[PDB]
Recover the amino acids of this structure.
């Protein structure tokens, strides 16, 4: 039927626990689909190498297909999506999808999710909107998308800025696109990288130990993202250790444990004074993604901050 | 006749200044209560700690028959943790209401004044008793267990994001339609009156390619318990998993919670808690699971007994 | 095996689009001894008073013959029927409503698992004395506060003001809330001998609203009118005037709100006592209609109706 | 150096007042524009403000005349100023905003603002709301984003913005597609812009109009009476918008009346009483068969705005559906 060619890159996850494609015979109505297995892991075990493989795969295979769907565990899909959002140079739709219920359960969500991810990958209007996550009839941008609930099939939301489009009857009404620079408009280029800078996450809370921050420091980590309290604030011991790290060759990004809203400049922390960077709307795991990539370009906290204001 | 209400002041943006100052800026408190202020500490709640926790519980318990209710003025950033600590440790049967402010007192449309007003309204309402320790923010009565910050700056940030609020405040009156089922205050076995420290519990975060070095550092330091902020339904990165499995075998209490802001970390999912001796946190977020785990550790070190605690409180 | 006896009363809805509903979910036999009866077979957009009277009477009459009930229903008005049953069911055992947002033949159709979970809830001894319930997307919701939030989302049903009662995981429920308002055997509404309910209609407010709907309901002698008001139950001027007239010439007038969350309060911009109006509080216009209809079976007096709206 | 900002005042609770800081009771549109401006002396740090009283009412009484007046004044005064703020009641702000979104041709920012607490209330929300509205109207980045609503530190597009709560200061949300930007320390980080066509990309021109087509709204629910629909039909309404159940469905009696109406000279639009999500084509109602139009994400009161303006161009239900799909 003059249909597009869509490539599925499989990484594992609950959606996949070749016969994945076969369980959605209706895919034949909308695309000529071909699958490849890149890895087969639970996304709780997602890592830098898988990321690099995947960006490299998409970038080199871009001209052989019309669109990509990546099948992926839900738990870290939001990280993978932002990492691809920043490192993919291919102009064609790249769509991640997962399932909250196993494939063998009652009212399993994966089949229709897969169908809708292919719809989205096949839609010429999906191009130039960056890397996308399609979950529960909704097209979500790679940067803002996050999990909101541990088990709900509707868990994926773009909690700060909203979704891009809703899918009804195999058609999308797009009403938004992300303003922040993505894909071809980023300076990030991992084509020749076999590793990424080391970036770890420390949590803040009443009476918080400095021992985690200390441990990352002791190991020579290139960057530390703080999951701060409220508007990216730090427990006094963690503050002291990160203040030292920032002046001793470690990039420090203030983010927040709070699920929505920006960690802003000009609030209780003098970031200029400490050599810190404020993560804006990027949650701790998102901020790690961008901090890693920023570190491949620069160690300068003021250039890092600018990166955090543009990507 | 108006109620005697005691404000225990701890600092926070609501104060940023002594407690006398706070009370005198909201003269309308004179129409609903006889307010007395005591300064307990004066800190940003980012610097909240176990010694202040223990001070507050002890104070409230000791001065319970001196007053008709308590309001605790507090920073927002960690209010949700103090409220839960107090919810499990206070034995006083009179209302205990925590408040703060998302905007500085000097700010245009500062939220602090009406927030404090409504906190006193709540503390003064007889209907407020026996509902546990409460947080009052943005015209809403929230329970200390479920209440959490939802946004970094929004005045409406405080929400009980899994089971909802208790009541809404309009024209100085509350319409309560909910009370928390989990055991609280005088129905808990937790008693901190003779404690001068709490057991040591830290929180580690999970994410892609997560370092095991945070968890190992806590283990090396002999931490009594570790709370994991897992991915999805409390899952762990493979390295972190290995580290905590080993720790649990030698007697560290390990609690699986989630970085995901709503919903339960369940038993009977991808992790065989029984096999590993882990505890599942239910709807308790990592900071809240810490509060409960520290208290559970004052009663037992047995993970099945800690799990029953996590199922009842 | 020693399983509870659970009755499915079928009313139609996309979940059906009884005997073959039950057969579609074999896993039911693991949790309940299930039997179905067809009550009606309609899309819930055509839900009506006569079906509500039939359901209430049936549950009340058949209460001793079963351990609990699941009511399969369309999604569009399930929130209405749920609150009607909440106020009229005298049976003490669980009554759980369930529907499906996706057609039964669609990919990832939600009906099978929803129904599984509705039987789980009906079977749970802990579900008793919580009022009539709606079970949708793994969540147990109370009949008073439950409403649609989205036109098509499988997660649409939420208790938007006070939250859910429990969450369902692996066939078990962790309940942490129960509705304070009075329900079921604690209400005085008794529909057992009623062949009809009082006429209550709903008018919508907006900029430049016409009084012509309100005037039509008054002209026809309606027993009450619910206003879907703007903001905190406010009324377009011409609508205000017509409802004021109606309030003093027999018609009970409830101010509710078009706005999806929050109470319509007393003591804002409208002096309800002066006009003889009743504030709906957290009841949305379709829910306020249900309560107003039932109030009007007990009293026409606006203070007593306000008291009912403060208690149920 | 500072921009020129015009405040066109309409009333609302933002200019309302009560008998005490602490009682909820208040009255709307007493206080004049000048009193609001003088309560925010910080305005002086960010704009040269000029205020004009257009009307002084509760937005509950907003109407087609006030809309027409506002649109004509903004289009007429566009070169006199760097941007406009319209102070307005909250209850129908979402309607005026979308009306203006479709009819204003001026290509400078037009920002609407209210308050959920009156000026006399403890922790009154108006003054900071006003300040942030002016910051929004002053920001060169706010241009070419349509008409805006600024409430609780958030910039919202006129089309999607709506009230979600009867009393919460945080009530205004863009419930389907989200906000455009958040305001912190007098600055906006814009991340979105509405895709649907607005202002100078719409064919709607009300400059010569003194009245708009008559369009009413009927609610759906169990046992719905057909009497409200019939009343609108007997008066010769130009259009009727149904606030449907679920995905724009209609109670059988209402369906029967509106079926007649669509083929007997009345435009009918299916919307939904459900607060978020689209009323779609290709669900349970064959719109083509019945001559109906589906509202998409437009709620009943927003769908009335677009239908009224659509009726100024066309009576053809196919053309009206094309309009609901573009604007
Ligand atoms: N642990 C699974 C969860 C899921 O896919 O639902 C994953 O991330 O791989
Ligand atoms: N950092 C402050 C924030 C506030 O109170 O708004 C605190 O938590 O103490
Ligand atoms: N119109 C159907 C919708 C559904 O059940 O999903 C009904 O309410 O009966
Ligand atoms: N009824 C008032 C409500 C408010 O503005 O808060 C108005 O819309 O004018």
């Amino acid at each position: 039927h003059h249909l597009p060619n869509i490539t599925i890159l499989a990484t594992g996850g609950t959606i996949a626990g070749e016969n994945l494609v076969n369980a959605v015979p209706q895919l034949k109505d909308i695309a000529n689909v071909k699958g490849e297995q890149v890895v087969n892991i639970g996304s709780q075990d997602m890592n830098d190498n898988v990321w690099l493989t995947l960006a490299k795969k998409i970038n080199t295979d871009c001209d052989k297909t019309d669109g990509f769907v990546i099948t992926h565990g839900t738990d870290t899909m939001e990280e993978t999506a932002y990492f691809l959002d920043l490192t993919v140079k291919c102009d064609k739709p790249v769509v991640m999808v997962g399932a909250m219920r196993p494939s063998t359960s009652m009212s399993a969500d994966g089949p229709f999710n897969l169908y809708n991810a292919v719809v989205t990958a096949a839609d010429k209007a999906s191009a130039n909107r960056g890397v996308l996550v399609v979950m529960n009839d909704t097209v979500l941008d790679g940067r803002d998308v996050t999990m909101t609930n541990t088990t709900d099939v509707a868990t994926f939301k773009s909690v700060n800025y909203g979704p891009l489009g809703y899918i009804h009857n195999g058609k999308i009404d797009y009403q938004r696109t992300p303003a922040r620079k993505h894909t071809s408009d980023t300076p990030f280029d991992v084509s020749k990288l076999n590793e990424l800078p080391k970036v770890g996450i420390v949590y803040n809370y009443a009476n918080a130990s400095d021992l985690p921050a200390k441990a990352l420091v002791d190991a020579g980590y290139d960057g530390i993202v703080s999951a701060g309290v409220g508007n990216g604030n730090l427990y006094k011991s963690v503050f002291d250790t990160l203040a030292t790290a920032a002046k001793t060759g470690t990039a420090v990004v203030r983010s927040s444990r709070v699920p929505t809203g920006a960690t802003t400049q000009d609030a209780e922390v003098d970031d200029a004074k400490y050599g810190f960077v404020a993560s804006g709307t990027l949650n701790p795991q998102k901020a790690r993604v961008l901090l890693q990539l920023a570190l491949t370009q620069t160690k300068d906290p003021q250039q890092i901050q600018q990166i955090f204001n543009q990507y």
